[PDB]
Amino acid sequence: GSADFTETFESSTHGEAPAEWTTIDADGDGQGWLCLSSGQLDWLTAHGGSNVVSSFSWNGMALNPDNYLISKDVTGATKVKYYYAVNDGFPGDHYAVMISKTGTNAGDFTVVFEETPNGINKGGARFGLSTEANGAKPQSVWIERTVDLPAGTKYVAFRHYNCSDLNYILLDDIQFTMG
Ligand SMILES: [Ca+2]
Ligand SMILES: [Ca+2]
């Protein structure tokens, strides 16, 4: 449709929640979804431009996330297409795509897609916001997904949850088909 648009995270800033999204730290550990820039982290390469959004299940220490990343009102959206990346040495950073037809409370969302990413499942280094800047870069391939949105979808959420002590999930180039 004519209102089709993409979230690139290029207008957001390293270390902040993305501009025009809201977040929930539902597990309560003070760690959630943050914009990261490749201009600040040597290990990171974005799918497009310099910026991504990120959520960690290991970041200097092991975590048990339940972190929601929630869109603006996208009433009219029929499809969301996006790219994700994980550390392919520790790939299983489980996530869901959810929709709400009403509000932005966690309970307003229902799962429409979820998966546990695959990888070499092979070990290696883990990467964080405090990991030493020795120039290593993870084995980390960008993977496309296209998810059907039920009629009435108003907000789309990405939920990193149901996993622990792997590494990260990154998202970029989240395109909403409006329719
Ligand atoms: Ca980007
Ligand atoms: Ca959290």
Domain locations in the chain as residue ranges: 1-179
Tokens 């550990």 — which residue?
A: 29
Q: What fold characterizes domain 1-179?
A: Jelly Rolls (2.60.120)
- Rounded to whole angstroms, the Cα distance separating 147 from 69 reads 16
For the CA of 49, the nearest ligand: 1
Resolution to one decimal, Å: 1.4
Which of these, 7, 151, 155, lies nearest to 71 by C-alpha position? 155
Q: Specify whether the backbone of 162 is left (phi greater than 0), alpha (psi in -120 to 50) or beta.
A: left
> For residues 70 and 157, is the Cβ–Cβ distance under 8 A?
yes
- Ligand 1 center from residue 18 Cα (angstroms): 11
Cross-strand bridge partners of residue 169: 55, 86
3-class secondary structure, 160: strand
- DSSP class of residue 17 equals P
Torsion of Cα atoms, 40 then 172 then 68 then 43, to 10°: -30
**Phi first, then psi: what are they for 135, rounded to 5°?**
90, -5
Helix, strand and coil percent figures for the chain, each rounded to 5? 0, 40, 60
- Ligand 2 center from residue 2 Cα (angstroms): 36
Token pair of 69, please? 């990343």
Token pair of 109, please? 């969302």
Q: Which technique was used to obtain these atomic coordinates?
A: X-ray
End-to-end CA, the chain:
5
- Cα 123 from chain centroid? 22
- Ligand 2 center from residue 66 Cα (angstroms): 5
E runs forming strands in 49-167: 51-56, 66-70, 79-86, 95-100, 109-115, 143-148, 155-161
Which of these, 29, 31, 8, 11, lies nearest to 19 by C-alpha position? 11
| Single-letter amino acid, residue 23 | T
- Ligand 2 center from residue 25 Cα (angstroms): 4
Q: What angle do CA 60, 56, 89 make, to 5 degrees?
A: 80
Which of these, 83, 16, 53, lies nearest to 168 by C-alpha position? 53
- Rounded to whole angstroms, the Cα distance separating 98 from 83 reads 16
Tokens 């916001």 — which residue?
A: 129
- Ligand 2 center from residue 35 Cα (angstroms): 15
> For residues 35 and 15, is the Cβ–Cβ distance under 8 A?
yes
- Ligand 2 center from residue 127 Cα (angstroms): 17
Q: Specify whether the backbone of 74 is left (phi greater than 0), alpha (psi in -120 to 50) or beta.
A: alpha
3-class secondary structure, 79: strand
Cross-strand bridge partners of residue 55: 169
- Cα 119 from chain centroid? 17
Q: How far lies 64's CA from each of 48, 97, 125, 156, in Å?
A: 28, 18, 19, 22
- Rounded to whole angstroms, the Cα distance separating 94 from 152 reads 26
- Rounded to whole angstroms, the Cα distance separating 19 from 89 reads 30
